[PDB]
Design a binder for these strands. Structure first.
Ligand SMILES: Nc1ccn([C@H]2C[C@H](O)[C@@H](COP(=O)(O)OP(=O)(O)OP(=O)(O)O)O2)c(=O)n1
Ligand SMILES: [Ca+2]
Ligand SMILES: [Ca+2]
Ligand SMILES: [Ca+2]
Ligand SMILES: [Ca+2]
Ligand code: NA
Length: 1112
DNA sequence: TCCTCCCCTAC
DNA sequence: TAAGGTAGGGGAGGA
């Protein structure tokens, strides 16, 4: 009430912004006809490309706003407009008693009186309901409203009634007790409109008086006006900038391929000149300069320029977190209004959004969709990886000084950030997101930023809606859970399977010893015919009938196999192969028809197992019960500072908070008495997957899988292509290489979303929660990969295994690739080691119970066999190096290096080199070391070459760093560690990051550690002696402080007052670093060297005793 | 020697 | 207030 006044004032303000920027609210010509989408052209109205959409309140051309959505269009004529749909918000009440429905209808029609606009009886399929497969629907009351405000009040009015639900004791029930639950009450409005109306951003539409008519003719988006900007500010030495005090010394940016720079000459010592920055032909960048007087000349110039070009997309890089908020503040102090200026402002999440223009923050794409590791999510590494060139770097601390000192080069660097950001946006973020919008009921701002789980839920809501299925409410996690009287600390299911089986060096040129099992060779022979058939019909989708050389090929293989049976002990060059199941979990789901609503609790079939794993306290109910009364006797603080009541009973805390104390009180009691905090126990469990249920969920997974397989296909064609034709150099292909990066990126950017269909069943607030399904997917996978390993174990050596992949060696004698010939001359490709696995998967893991609706009207189901699980193969490779543990008998999982034959790095997994932070010495040393495994011409020769490098590095550290320039040394010895939260939120915890952060607070001021995500860069020191490692962490920033400053703290931290030497060398605990460098040499070189019968190739690093002992 | 925390990778 | 999952390496503390 009365707050519609607000939004209509605001909605109105937006309407003026939209008009300023070129979106006049357009209304289609009146027409009362019966148009056929066939004849769209005949119909009066405007054709536009939908580029955006937002919820707004609208004035009646009582007196309260009407809710609707503004849809932002670009038209075929290079213009823009916005059209508005209105649509009453709604949600449902569901009831226990089907019979008394009109009863409740009358109650609420009056009880809600004040806010209700309409009311109605509708029917939706509820999968929670018995025999809905026979056609039975749940009956609901559709509650509609004039605006979302009114809808919220209705919820407020039913809150009471709902909780209450959940006289003459010697005893026609009241209409209140029948209201069991409301439904679809938390669907965001604009989503509600996009789904029901079936409108998507990114699609073409003719706006007519009937509604939006999709023009399926138009292929290709329209070309919005894209601007990308990056700002540079003044920093203090060693500190973060402050919008409070510091100035925007420049603002570089691009607009449809044309650079601009805006300098603030109150900082820039000279009028900068127009210049060309063009990292590559594909990326031309000529800039124009707007040297401006002070801060505000630049600001206003910026805004004027936005207004001028009217951009629908403004892109940045972490602009939400830094760039925008800066600008905003510098705008206020200069007394400008940014909202009035260009119509941008922060939303409820502190993120900066406009109405007419999307703010595409590329960092969001990198974080979520790039599949890059966090250590490579900076604009430089992103640029290197995704753009293929080396961006300009500049030490942050020099950016201010160079403003005066070397201005033009500072300006050169700034345009680089923009060129990167702009072409990263246009080449990756733009197509991906906007295409994503064509299937997801979100606008670009949201399609870029929502969790992938949320992207999945949206898709599933469409699918459920269009099938007339009623949405389950969001799941809420339970307060506490028990197992055998024990309070469960945590519980889950056993995930994927991971094995480290062999360490060492493996090269296509160094023979390896094989111990083949003739038995296994037998089986492959007996299977061969049916397997070869499988490859043709299934893997390639043909018939053996059209096959020319099915028989030649069968013996080529057979000969080699037989040879291996007799000659089963051999010694030859290895084929270094990798096999990996394509979209494993999604295909396990779609194969077994796994979906949350198919898991029935005995009522009311495919039995599949999973493995539950609980982590519980050793204590029991009595001890649990005992602990509570003790806790009932205490006081706690009132969380809600909106009350003057400061002290709270235990029973007054939420059940939620209660359980926290109980846990932390019971954890200690457990410790003293039992005397462990957790017990873990694994229980095999079984579940029933009904095979006839509405497959709307699993169908959605299938649709999105197929969407990714295509990208995965042609990205294999261009990999396919490259290898032959364009590998002849000279060439500007190069282009083939550029296709692959772009497709593998698209297929990869789908990968996390796809696999989130699996994770979604486990997410908080999931509408489709099922732990059973998630467990079943994982146990099936574990079973499949262990079957594969067991086979390879017998015809080669598996080196490492993770969830759905095996790295292995096979003997060169093992049959590999062949081609089937057709009557048509076309050739079908076969990789026997792959297809040999796949035939076996399908023999054992096929779903023979898969059912489907052939006849919906007659409810007739047909049964058939489903299986879409396939290993695919890559390689063979030139080399794979695998680390080994320091602890005996244990290995290292999820770490290795693989090299192509052309000598390039195929894959680096897991190592510190790739990780964010870590000790830089180790990163560099690892960078150095791996390629050296490609040398020597014997095994021990290989370790020889690799040791030499080890020794140069040991030297540097034994040498106490005397060999190293000061600027180089300070780089190598740094360790960078990200604090995930803020220092304060760690209280009672000891870490090198904490200490460093602490000290970085005093040296520079608590303004340094205010925010989250602080990068603590530190060294270890010898002094104070004896002090635990977490105590000797020193902020590298000190050695850049002016001397008097460095003294006090060095003195303060070293805990020795006398000291007056300030060389970083005097400080460093070299014994620390020699040792961390030694552990790496051990795991990566010497200990793997051992396991292959090679004496310690780096004797300056001594074996572990246990490994010495094993020597004898 | 083991567990536990945290960050960040691998699936 | 919005929010996919589990398995693992390894540094560092302490039971
Ligand atoms: N971000 C990820 C990566 C993987 N997985 C789970 C589900 C995957 O199916 C399984 C296998 O990992 P892959 O990396 O092998 O994933 P796919 O098999 O799904 O991908 P590809 O088609 O590249 O083989 O692990 C996951 O849940 N989330
Ligand atoms: Ca920036
Ligand atoms: Ca896979
Ligand atoms: Ca894999
Ligand atoms: Ca671990
Ligand atoms: Na390692």
């Amino acid at each position: 009430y009365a707050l519609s006044a607000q939004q209509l004032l605001n909605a109105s303000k937006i309407d003026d912004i939209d008009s300023m920027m070129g979106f006049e609210r357009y209304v289609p010509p009146q027409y009362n006809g019966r148009f056929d989408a066939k004849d769209i052209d005949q119909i009066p109205g405007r054709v536009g490309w939908l580029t955006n959409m937002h919820a707004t309140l609208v004035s009646q051309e009582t007196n309260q706003g009407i809710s609707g959505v503004d849809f932002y269009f670009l038209d075929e004529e290079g213009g823009s407009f916005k059209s508005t749909v209105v649509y009453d918000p709604y949600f449902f009440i569901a009831c226990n008693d089907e019979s008394r429905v009109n009863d409740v209808e009358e109650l609420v029609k009056k009880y809600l009186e004040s806010c209700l606009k309409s009311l109605q009886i509708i029917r939706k399929e509820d999968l929670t309901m018995d025999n809905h497969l026979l056609g039975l629907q749940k009956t609901l009351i559709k509650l509609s409203f004039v605006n979302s405000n009114q809808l919220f009040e209705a919820r407020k009015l039913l809150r009471p009634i709902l909780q209450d639900n959940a006289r003459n004791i010697y005893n026609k029930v009241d209409a209140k007790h029948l209201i069991e639950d409301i439904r679809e009450y938390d669907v965001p409005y604009h989503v509600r409109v996009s789904i029901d109306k079936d409108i998507r951003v990114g699609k073409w539409y003719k706006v007519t008086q009937q509604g939006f008519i999709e023009d399926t003719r138009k292929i290709a988006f329209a070309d919005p006006v894209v601007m990308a900007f990056d700002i540079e500010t003044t920093k203090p030495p060693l500190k973060f900038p402050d919008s409070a005090v510091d100035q925007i010394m420049m603002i570089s940016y691009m607009i449809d391929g044309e650079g601009f720079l805006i300098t603030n000459r109150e900082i820039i010592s000279e009028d900068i000149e127009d210049f060309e920055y063009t990292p590559k032909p594909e990326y031309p960048g000529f800039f124009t300069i707007f040297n401006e007087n002070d801060e505000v000349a630049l600001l206003q110039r910026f805004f004027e320029h936005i207004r001028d070009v009217r951009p629908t997309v403004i892109s940045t890089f972490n602009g939400d977190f830094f760039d925008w908020p800066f600008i905003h503040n510098r705008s206020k102090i200069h007394g400008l209004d940014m909202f009035d200026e260009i119509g941008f402002a922060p939303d409820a999440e502190g993120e900066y959004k406009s109405s007419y223009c999307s703010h595409m923050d590329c960092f969001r794409w990198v974080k979520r969709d790039s599949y890059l590791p966090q250590g490579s999510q900076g604009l430089k590494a992103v640029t290197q990886s995704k753009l293929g060139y080396n961006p300009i770097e500049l030490d942050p601390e020099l950016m201010t000084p160079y403003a005066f000192e070397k201005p033009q080069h500072l300006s050169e660097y700034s345009v680089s950030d923009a060129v990167a950001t702009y072409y990263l946006y246009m080449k990756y973020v733009h197509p991906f997101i906007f295409s994503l919008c064509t299937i997801i009921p979100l606008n670009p701002d949201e399609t870029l930023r929502k969790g992938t789980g949320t992207l999945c839920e949206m898709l599933l809501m469409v699918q459920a809606y269009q099938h007339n299925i009623l949405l389950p409410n969001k799941h809420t996690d339970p307060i506490e859970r028990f197992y055998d009287g024990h309070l469960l600390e945590s519980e889950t299911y056993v995930g994927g399977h991971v094995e480290s089986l062999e360490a060492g060096v493996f090269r296509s040129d160094l023979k390896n010893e094989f111990k083949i099992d003739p038995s296994a060779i037998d089986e492959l022979l007996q299977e061969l015919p049916e397997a070869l058939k499988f490859s043709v019909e299934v893997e390639n989708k043909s018939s053996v009938d059209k096959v020319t050389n099915f028989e030649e090929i069968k013996n080529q293989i057979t000969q080699k196999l037989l040879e291996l049976k007799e000659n089963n002990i051999r010694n030859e060059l290895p084929l270094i192969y990798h096999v990996d199941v394509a979209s494993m979990y999604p295909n396990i789901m779609t194969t077994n028809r796994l979906q949350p609503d198919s898991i029935k609790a005995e009522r009311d079939a495919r039995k599949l197992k999973w493995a539950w794993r609980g982590e519980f306290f050793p204590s029991k109910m009595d001890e649990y019960n005992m602990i509570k009364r003790a806790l009932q006797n205490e006081t706690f603080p009132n969380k809600n500072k909106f009350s003057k009541k400061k002290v709270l009973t235990f029973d007054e805390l939420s059940y939620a908070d209660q359980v926290i104390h109980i846990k932390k009180r019971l954890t200690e009691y457990s410790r003293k008495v039992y005397h462990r905090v957790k017990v873990s126990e694994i229980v095999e469990r079984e579940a029933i997957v009904c095979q006839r249920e509405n497959p709307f969920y699993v169908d959605t997974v299938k649709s999105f899988r197929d969407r990714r397989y295509e990208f995965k296909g042609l990205a294999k064609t261009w990999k396919g292509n490259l290898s032959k034709i364009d590998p002849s150099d000279k060439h500007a292909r190069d282009e083939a290489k550029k296709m692959i990066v772009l497709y593998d990126s698209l297929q990869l950017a789908h990968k996390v979303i796809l696999n989130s269909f699996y994770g979604y069943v486990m997410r908080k607030g999931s509408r489709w929660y099922s732990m059973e399904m998630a467990g079943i997917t994982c146990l099936t996978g574990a079973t499949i990969i262990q079957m594969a390993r067991a086979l390879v174990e017998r015809v080669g050596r598996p080196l490492e295994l993770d969830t759905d992949g095996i790295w292995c060696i096979l003997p060169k004698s093992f049959p590999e690739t062949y081609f089937f010939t057709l009557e048509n001359g076309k050739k079908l490709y076969l990789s026997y080691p792959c297809s040999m696995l796949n035939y076996r998967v399908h023999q054992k893991f096929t779903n023979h119970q898969y059912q489907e609706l052939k006849d919906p009207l007659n409810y007739i189901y047909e049964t058939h066999s489903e299986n879409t699980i396939f290993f695919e193969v890559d390689g063979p490779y030139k080399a794979m190096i695998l680390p080994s543990s320091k602890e005996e008998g244990k290995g290292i999982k999820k770490r290795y290096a693989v090299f192509n034959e052309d000598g390039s790095l195929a894959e680096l997994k897991g190592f510190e080199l790739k990780r964010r932070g870590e000790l830089q010495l180790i990163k560099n040393f690892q960078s150095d070391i791996f390629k050296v495994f490609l040398e020597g011409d014997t095994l021990e020769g290989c370790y020889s070459a690799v040791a030499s490098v080890c020794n140069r590095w040991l030297d540097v550290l034994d040498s106490h760093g005397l060999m190293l320039e000061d600027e180089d040394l300070v780089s190598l010895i740094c360790e960078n560690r990200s604090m995930s939260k803020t220092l304060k939120e760690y209280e009672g915890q000891k870490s090198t990051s904490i200490t460093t952060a602490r000290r970085l607070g005093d040296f520079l001021g608590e303004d340094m550690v205010k925010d989250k995500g602080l990068q603590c860069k530190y060294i270890i020191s010898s002094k104070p002696f004896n002090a635990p490692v977490t105590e000797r962490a020193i902020p590298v920033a000190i050695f850049s402080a002016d001397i008097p400053i460095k003294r006090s703290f060095l003195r303060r931290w070293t805990l020795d007052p006398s000291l007056e030497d300030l060389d970083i060398r005097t400080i460093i605990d070299w014994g620390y670093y020699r040792e961390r460098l030694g552990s790496a040499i051990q795991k990566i070189i010497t200990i793997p060297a051992a396991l292959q019968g090679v004496s310690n190739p780096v004797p300056r690093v001594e074996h572990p005793d246990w490994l010495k002992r094993k020597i004898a």
